[PDB]
Amino acid sequence: LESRWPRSVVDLIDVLENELKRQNVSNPRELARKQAVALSCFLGGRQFYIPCGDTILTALRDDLLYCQFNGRNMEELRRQYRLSQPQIYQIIARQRKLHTRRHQP
DNA sequence: TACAGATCGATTATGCCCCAATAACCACACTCAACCCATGATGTTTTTTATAATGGGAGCTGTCACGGATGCA
């Protein structure tokens, strides 16, 4: 029944709304409701799978680390993030080129 | 009145970008020897002594008894 339960829709409104109130946006409840309608029309009937495993959260977790990376602070960014240096080496090199084009398009 | 189908809607398959680790390959470095060259303290060797000095035995060894040469007288 859950696989055919119209319960998720309402779950989308508050998840939207609690963010809008966090972003100090006016009329967050009504704003979230019409957004939920917008999701329903596009996503209606489509087999639509979204990335799991904090996929956007890491890519953002990636960004601010590169902001804190000073070329010497490898170890403290290791402790603060629990990520091991090997991957940090790779992500920092990637973010290097990423922000390289950011600073120099 | 009895018997059929028909679309909404769910589990299953198959493949790959990423990617969170995987391992080799290359880069620069401090600490600890190793040997040498002094300074000097310790070691080793050589030289000289001007009253006069002028021959030991150093402890013997304490004792058997055959044979075969052996060098003489």
The Cα–Cα gap between A84 and A74 comes to 10
Please give the nucleotide, over all strands, whose C1' is closest to the CA of residue A82.
B20
Q: Please, what's the largest Cα pairwise distance for chain A? A: 55
CB atoms within 10 A of CB A78: 14
Positions 27-66 in A, CB within 7 angstroms of strand B: 45, 58-59
Q: What is the CA radius of gyration of chain A?
A: 19
- Which structure tokens are listed for A86? 């090997």
Q: Which CA distances in Å does A37 have to A33, A42, A59?
A: 7, 9, 28
Nearest-5° Cα angle at A44, A29 to A42 = 70
Resolution in A: 3.2
The single-letter DSSP state of residue A83 is -
The Cα–Cα gap between A72 and A53 comes to 29
Experimental determination approach used: cryo-EM
Terminal C-alpha separation, chain A: 51
Residues A83 and A57: beta-carbon distance below 8 Å? no
